[PDB]
């Protein structure tokens, strides 16, 4: 039929502001789930709930459909569902990648096509923590951030964002880039610039 479990509908109602599950709702929901906004697991949540844009409110039907399918009616249940996705974020490279690429689409401001470098950098700092499955030399990550700042790269395109994961797995160190990187491959042009910059600072 049509009625979701009362307990699930109470959860929705609890969070909404002036009839909408808005930005303030999602923040409170994350808080009550027991997370900080810095926690990558919050991206699994958004993805699980099918957010396309953070600016747009989450529809009731969408909120209810999603939890009904996870067998959740209570915060406790939802905590358990996210905890599980959080483990999968750390352990399953394919899932991490998907969530990584998804991050970009949410970071995008409305009406933009590239993300601002500062926002991008802030998110790269989250994704490249040693607990996560793509590990590289700290100096290399720092050199990348520094490059973007020093050379005036104020925006990051989807291609650059998506490709950087393969890049870092393929060359975990500055020296590996120096010794193996080929400019005539099909890397994003900004990655070619990064190589030249590193080549200079030898």
């Amino acid at each position: 039929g049509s009625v979701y479990p009362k307990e699930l509908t109470q959860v929705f109602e609890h969070y909404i502001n002036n009839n909408l599950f808005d930005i303030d709702s999602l923040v409170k929901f994350i808080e009550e789930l027991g997370y900080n906004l810095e926690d990558l697991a919050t991206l699994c949540l958004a993805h699980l709930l099918g957010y396309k844009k953070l600016e747009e409110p989450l529809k009731r039907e969408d909120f209810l459909s999603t939890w009904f399918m996870q067998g959740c009616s209570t915060i406790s249940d939802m905590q358990e569902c996210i905890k599980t996705l959080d483990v999968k974020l750390h352990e399953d490279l394919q899932y991490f990648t998907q969530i990584y690429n998804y991050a970009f689409n949410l970071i995008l401001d409305p009406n933009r096509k590239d993300i601002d470098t500062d926002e991008g950098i802030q998110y790269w700092k989250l994704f490249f923590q040693p607990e996560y499955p793509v590990r590289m030399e700290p100096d290399l990550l720092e050199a990348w951030f520094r490059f973007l700042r020093d050379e005036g790269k104020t925006t990051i395109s989807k291609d650059t964002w998506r490709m950087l994961l393969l890049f870092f797995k393929r060359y975990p160190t500055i020296q590996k880039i120096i010794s193996d990187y080929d400019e005539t491959a099909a890397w994003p042009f900004i990655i070619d610039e990064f190589y030249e910059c590193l080549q200079d600072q030898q």
């Binding site: 930005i23 303030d24 999602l26 923040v27 994350i30 906004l37 810095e38 926690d39 919050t42 991206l43 958004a46 953070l54 600016e55 949410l106 970071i107 926002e119 802030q122 998110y123 989250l126």
Partner: peptide, 12 residues
Amino acid sequence: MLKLRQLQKKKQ
């Protein structure tokens, strides 16, 4: 969800 906090500051 850092973007979410940014959006809060913009709305406030």
